[PDB]
């Protein structure tokens, strides 16, 4: 892939394939000259070594290194490890329609609702706002809706308030030790840039207000919204799942 400027970036597999092909072609050329058996034997040993390095580098001998003097990644290295397809990308990956921010108190809330900044809410729910603007006739095409939301007109905030009405959002804190580390709340649009979290739920998250941050995800499908409302809502999880005791005790 070309990078900015005249520079390039390449995967280590290109080097390994080039070595395999170079040695294979050299062996094919050599078998026509009727060379002494010493040479062909050495060539075949080298070909075996190169194919071995390609399939799995650093398992039988010494790992072949590159210009940066680090061991090249082979096909096997791209599957195993904590940084392989099986773990780094198949069981957890980055997600659209998500945000994060610092959390504050908001002691005026009800147990089933949270405080969501207007800016974050506007960014996360953009397609919904486009759909509403087109449906209500405020905008003709999707480009007009885009420009309207980009200028942040007056109607845009009423449309946003209509979109948010009954639409849960999942709040999560990074050390998710049990299932109460993800919970669905109903947003309340606020000014500022911090998320207001109901006090009684803090113990469930193990969250204090000395600099912690939370991530917010928005369910998209009807099934996801209904699951958040019926399974993950904060007013459904008031008992601990390890024992029967409440986990919504005043602190």
């Amino acid at each position: 892939v070309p990078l900015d400027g005249g520079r390039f970036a390449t995967s280590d597999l290109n080097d390994l394939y080039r070595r395999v092909i170079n040695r294979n072609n050299r062996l094919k050329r050599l078998l026509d000259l009727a060379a002494p058996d010493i040479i062909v034997r050495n060539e075949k040993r080298m070909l075996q070594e190169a194919v071995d390095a390609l399939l799995d580098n650093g398992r039988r001998g010494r790992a072949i290194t590159g210009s940066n003097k680090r061991p090249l990644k082979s096909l096997a290295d791209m599957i195993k490890g904590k940084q392989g397809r099986f773990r780094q990308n198949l069981l957890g990956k980055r997600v659209d329609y998500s945000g994060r921010s610092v959390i504050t108190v908001g002691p005026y809330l009800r147990l089933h609702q949270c405080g969501l900044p207007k800016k974050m809410a506007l960014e996360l729910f953009k397609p919904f706002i486009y759909g509403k603007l087109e449906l209500r006739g405020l905008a003709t095409t999707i480009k007009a809706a885009k420009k309207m939301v980009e200028r942040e007109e007056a109607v845009v905030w009423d449309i946003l308030d209509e979109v948010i009405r009954e639409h849960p959002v999942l709040l999560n804190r990074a050390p998710t030790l049990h299932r109460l580390g993800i919970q669905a709340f109903e947003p309340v649009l606020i000014e500022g840039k911090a998320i207001q979290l109901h006090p009684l739920v803090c113990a469930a998250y193990n969250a204090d207000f000395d600099g912690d941050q939370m991530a917010v995800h928005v369910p998209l499908t009807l099934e996801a919204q209904l699951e958040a409302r019926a399974l993950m809502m904060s007013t459904n999880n008031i008992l601990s799942p390890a024992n029967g005791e409440p986990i919504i005790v005043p602190s």
Binding site: G6, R7, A9, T10, S11, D12, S67, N68, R70
Partner: peptide, 12 residues
């Protein structure tokens, strides 16, 4: 001088 030098390893 503008030759592309040598590509950067993508795992650096």
């Amino acid at each position: 001088l503008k030759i592309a030098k040598e590509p950067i390893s993508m795992e650096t």
